[PDB]
Amino acid sequence: MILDKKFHGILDQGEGVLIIFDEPPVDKTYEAALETIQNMSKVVDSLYNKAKKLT
Amino acid sequence: FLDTVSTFTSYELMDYKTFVTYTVYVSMIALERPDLREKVIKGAEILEVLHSLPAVRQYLFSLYECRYSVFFQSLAVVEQEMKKDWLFAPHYRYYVREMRIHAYSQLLESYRSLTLGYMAEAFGVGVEFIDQELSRFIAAGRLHCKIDKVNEIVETNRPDSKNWQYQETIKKGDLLLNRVQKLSRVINM
Amino acid sequence: DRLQFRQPSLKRSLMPYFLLTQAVRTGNLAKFNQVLDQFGEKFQADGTYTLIIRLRHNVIKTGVRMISLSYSRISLADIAQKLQLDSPEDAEFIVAKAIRDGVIEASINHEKGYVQSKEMIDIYSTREPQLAFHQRISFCLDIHNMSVKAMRFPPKSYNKDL
Amino acid sequence: TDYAKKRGWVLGPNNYYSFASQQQKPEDTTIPSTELAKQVIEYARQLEMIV
Amino acid sequence: AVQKVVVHPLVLLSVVDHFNRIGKVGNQKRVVGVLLGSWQKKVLDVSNSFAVPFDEDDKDDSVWFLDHDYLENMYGMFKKVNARERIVGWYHTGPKLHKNDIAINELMKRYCPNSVLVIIDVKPKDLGLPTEAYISVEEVHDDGTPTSKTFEHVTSEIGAEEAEEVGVEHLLRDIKDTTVGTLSQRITNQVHGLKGLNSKLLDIRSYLEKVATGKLPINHQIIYQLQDVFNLLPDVSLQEFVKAFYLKTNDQMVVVYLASLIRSVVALHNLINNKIANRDAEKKEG
Amino acid sequence: RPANHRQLTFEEIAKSAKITVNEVELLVMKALSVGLVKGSIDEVDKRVHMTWVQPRVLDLQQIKGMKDRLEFWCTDVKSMEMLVEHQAHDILT
Amino acid sequence: LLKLFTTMELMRWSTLVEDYGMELRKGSLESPATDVFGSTEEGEKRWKDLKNRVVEHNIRIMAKYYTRITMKRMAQLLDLSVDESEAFLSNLVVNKTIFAKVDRLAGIINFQRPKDPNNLLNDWSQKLNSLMSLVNKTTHLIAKEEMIHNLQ
């Protein structure tokens, strides 16, 4: 069920320590990464345009 | 392979059962459990074609139930079937390692502190082999954090969530830094 | 190794060196000592055998570094045979020589006669974060700021004549 | 003899004791916050000076 | 009763008129005017007001001069033209609070309802808020001192309704609006330190002096709560706030990424045009 | 002590009030029952945490400490203000 | 009723034993205690559930307090087994004990100290504290500034 990720938790064998944690800022890193990836295409295409207009 | 519903028997290139036998590798290995549940488990295709051979069904059930006992026992058949193929020959080294590291990552996903006993009983293999195995999967594998044997029990940390999610953009950030250094290089010449 | 760059030059240039540079991670002294000199041509034609006579005994340092990246507990038999060196003194001695380098992290402890290590490779995440990425933020912001200057001055060089 | 008057450490029951190891106390975070504020000022300068 | 009040600049500008029509007297003592507003609503609102002659004596401080007839006439005509505003209280331009002010306010405490007292300065050298709203109520004293009129500080804000903003903005053409950005924010981030500096320096000195060197038991008891507030922050080591600093610095990193990326996007058109326009202009020049 | 390791222990309390370690829980329970103290200790290992309290009548050393901490705070705020505004006025204005 | 009102102090029920006993003894007021106890099962159920209700109640009272009263030691001071305490926890799960922090090693329980989100808990606390400090420092300061004018 943890592998199914229906909830937040992790098991243990020897120690038997149960740890529960969550990560609220989900929408931040996603949109940030999307912005980076999208802008990469812009910069690369710009490099293509400059390489075309120069050499 | 989502078009398998409309696919029929073809004597021109490859037979249907051969196509299924070929795609079962990428479907079982390259696709994780959510992908399986979303595609093949929800789909009736594998439900229909599992009656073809008893092997495939066992291979799927053993992996889905995370049982390496029968898996390593039938692993020989999988290895022999993997090789001696036309186009599937050069990749026989890749699928094995990929499946092993995928199984290890899957098992270490829901587990943090693992004792040697339960692990040795689960995999049914010696500790000395998984020793060098995991030891290689640390550096060369690059899956999880450092493992310490001081307690004679496998214990990980894996802070790959919180700070690391924000540290996923540092690589593309450095690449972007080099790329704007390139942009600065185009300047004036 | 070579990944992103595909050209039919560096490949052929690295072909004789590929086997040995791949053999570096393995770290076998005895065999590769003869193997290098066997087919060795160009890198030994570099002259005066300098970086290679350094490399020969650098193999054991990179190897013990791989041990530093490996587990803590050191066997008197198993890993001693794996490293092809068996002796109580030189083991802990060379290990200590790897510790004094400061390139790794280890905790020297003696209780039953066995030497353990904490060997924590864990990053700066959730440990003194500010002082950790401080210089990174400053430097990267400096680069991005001189990049702002780089998007500043050339447009002026465009607008100078118009 | 020499290293005793050189290193100037303590000697126990036939054993060498080591001190001042990772016992260093971190900062109060007040000073680096101030120098970071100064860095913010410098950022204000570099971003807007010529303006 | 009243949580907060609203004071329009018009009355203070009427005080500016009080400093206008003086005509070089050579007396220029405190002048008590009559403030008007709406006591109907919970929040007090000041529209306009008028002025009444007020004189005192050099030696004797108990001398105060008001006018009932002029007040009833002015308020009568003002109520005749506008029924949306009535009497509330009075105000003085004196920087210091005289003891006779309780007797001065007692009149409007009798004839009118409870009055609010406003203290301002004759010379606008004060950087802080010139207007302090003081409600007049009778509170039970803890020390056991006889019940007397006590002035309690009430928070206030300076604002205008509709046209007054336009009039002020037109007459000034100097001051700037909020204008979110670099200079508008950094000006505040600079001068605010002085805003606290001059005030605190003007306060804690006279405080330190009058505490040890002085008498007339003004009930220092509240100042123990003052010092208590000063002790509410026992030099936190920030050790618990480290994670908060990490999150804040993470947000700072987000700002860095956003800035760098956006500026990288803006640099496109510039680092295109700077080439393509110049080369074409140059090749088509001759 | 307004500063310098506010953190304390029940040792001093039990020594001054000559009471055992068993009755200090009921003691602080009564202390929280009155409502003059908001103190709540999050401790695991033996510890005592303290909070806001009323000066009430008077203290001389707390007056000296008042003028001291106040003078220090004031000259610090002044020093930082002048230090920042020094370059801030020139490079920004 | 005063002890059941608010701010209940921890005390032994053995002192209340003879109180309820004499409450059964005297017929001046609240006489039909025997009529209340007329049913053998009902009386025991009501009594046991009363003791359970108050032994839950005081826990709910100290739940607001972060003082960490260490119920492990409290069980020793009350001279009771931990089994019925675990039963009281079985009552606590339907009493909504869902917010808490426990330990595998020791029996120390924590009704506070959560993950502490930087934008929520410490943020709100710093908000209220700093704001109250600022406005309070704003009031009595200038209030005193007005008070020293009475000396002139």
From Swiss-Prot, chain A:
Subcellular location: Nucleus; Cytoplasm, Cytosol
Tissue: Highly expressed in embryonic stem cells (ESCs). Expression decreases as ESCs differentiate.
Description of what induces expression: By FOXO4; expression in embryonic stem cells (ESCs) is mediated by FOXO4.
Post-translational note: Phosphorylated by AMPK.
Position of the signal peptide: none
Family: Belongs to the proteasome subunit S9 family.
Function description: Component of the 26S proteasome, a multiprotein complex involved in the ATP-dependent degradation of ubiquitinated proteins. This complex plays a key role in the maintenance of protein homeostasis by removing misfolded or damaged proteins, which could impair cellular functions, and by removing proteins whose functions are no longer required. Therefore, the proteasome participates in numerous cellular processes, including cell cycle progression, apoptosis, or DNA damage repair. In the complex, PSMD11 is required for proteasome assembly.
Quaternary structure annotation from Swiss-Prot or TrEMBL: Component of the 19S proteasome regulatory particle complex. The 26S proteasome consists of a 20S core particle (CP) and two 19S regulatory subunits (RP). The regulatory particle is made of a lid composed of 9 subunits including PSMD11, a base containing 6 ATPases and few additional components.
Protein name in the entry: 26S proteasome non-ATPase regulatory subunit 11
Species: Homo sapiens (Human)
Gene name of the encoded protein: PSMD11
Residues of the full protein shown: 368 to 422 of 422
Curated annotation (Swiss-Prot), chain E:
UniProt keywords, alphabetically: Acetylation, Isopeptide bond, Proteasome, Ubl conjugation
Pfam families per record: JAB, MitMem_reg
Lineage: superkingdom: Eukaryota
UniProt keyword annotation of Ubl conjugation present: yes
Positions of post-translational N6-acetyllysine modification: K200, K210
Gene Ontology biological-process annotations: proteasome-mediated ubiquitin-dependent protein catabolic process
Function: Component of the 26S proteasome, a multiprotein complex involved in the ATP-dependent degradation of ubiquitinated proteins. This complex plays a key role in the maintenance of protein homeostasis by removing misfolded or damaged proteins, which could impair cellular functions, and by removing proteins whose functions are no longer required. Therefore, the proteasome participates in numerous cellular processes, including cell cycle progression, apoptosis, or DNA damage repair.
PANTHER family, sorted: 26S PROTEASOME NON-ATPASE REGULATORY SUBUNIT 7 (PTHR10540:SF7), EUKARYOTIC TRANSLATION INITIATION FACTOR 3 SUBUNIT F-RELATED (PTHR10540)
Further comment: Does not bind a metal ion.
Family listed: Belongs to the peptidase M67A family.
Name recorded for this polypeptide: 26S proteasome non-ATPase regulatory subunit 7
Protein encoded by which gene: PSMD7
Swiss-Prot record, chain F:
Role this protein plays: Component of the 26S proteasome, a multiprotein complex involved in the ATP-dependent degradation of ubiquitinated proteins. This complex plays a key role in the maintenance of protein homeostasis by removing misfolded or damaged proteins, which could impair cellular functions, and by removing proteins whose functions are no longer required. Therefore, the proteasome participates in numerous cellular processes, including cell cycle progression, apoptosis, or DNA damage repair.
Entry keyword annotation includes Acetylation: yes
Lineage: superkingdom: Eukaryota
Swiss-Prot/TrEMBL keywords: Acetylation, Proteasome
Organism field: Homo sapiens (Human)
Keyword Membrane: no
Residues modified to N6-acetyllysine: K15
Name of the protein this chain belongs to: 26S proteasome non-ATPase regulatory subunit 13
Family: Belongs to the proteasome subunit S11 family.
Gene Ontology biological process terms, A to Z: meiosis I; proteasome-mediated ubiquitin-dependent protein catabolic process; ubiquitin-dependent protein catabolic process
A GO CC term assigned to this protein in UniProt: secretory granule lumen
Signal peptide: none
Coiled coil (UniProt feature): none
Molecular function via GO: structural molecule activity
Subunit structure, as described in the record: Component of the 19S proteasome regulatory particle complex. The 26S proteasome consists of a 20S core particle (CP) and two 19S regulatory subunits (RP). The regulatory particle is made of a lid composed of 9 subunits including PSMD13, a base containing 6 ATPases and few additional components.
Swiss-Prot record, chain G:
Annotated protein name in UniProt: 26S proteasome non-ATPase regulatory subunit 12
Domain of life: Eukaryota
Source species: Homo sapiens (Human)
Segment of the intact protein contained: 305 to 456 of 456
Keyword match Ubl conjugation: yes
Coiled coil: none
Protein function: Component of the 26S proteasome, a multiprotein complex involved in the ATP-dependent degradation of ubiquitinated proteins. This complex plays a key role in the maintenance of protein homeostasis by removing misfolded or damaged proteins, which could impair cellular functions, and by removing proteins whose functions are no longer required. Therefore, the proteasome participates in numerous cellular processes, including cell cycle progression, apoptosis, or DNA damage repair.
Residues with the N6-acetyllysine modification: K64
Alphabetized UniProt keyword annotations: Acetylation, Intellectual disability, Isopeptide bond, Proteasome, Ubl conjugation
Residue ranges of the TM segments: none
Family: Belongs to the proteasome subunit p55 family.
Gene Ontology CC annotation, any one: cytosol
Positions of the PCI domain: 1-116
Lineage: Eukaryota, Metazoa, Chordata, Craniata, Vertebrata
Disease tied to this entry: Stankiewicz-Isidor syndrome: A neurodevelopmental disorder characterized by delayed psychomotor development, intellectual disability, behavioral disorders, mild dysmorphism, ophthalmologic anomalies, feeding difficulties, deafness, and variable congenital malformations of the cardiac and/or urogenital systems.
Gene Ontology biological process terms, A to Z: proteasome-mediated ubiquitin-dependent protein catabolic process
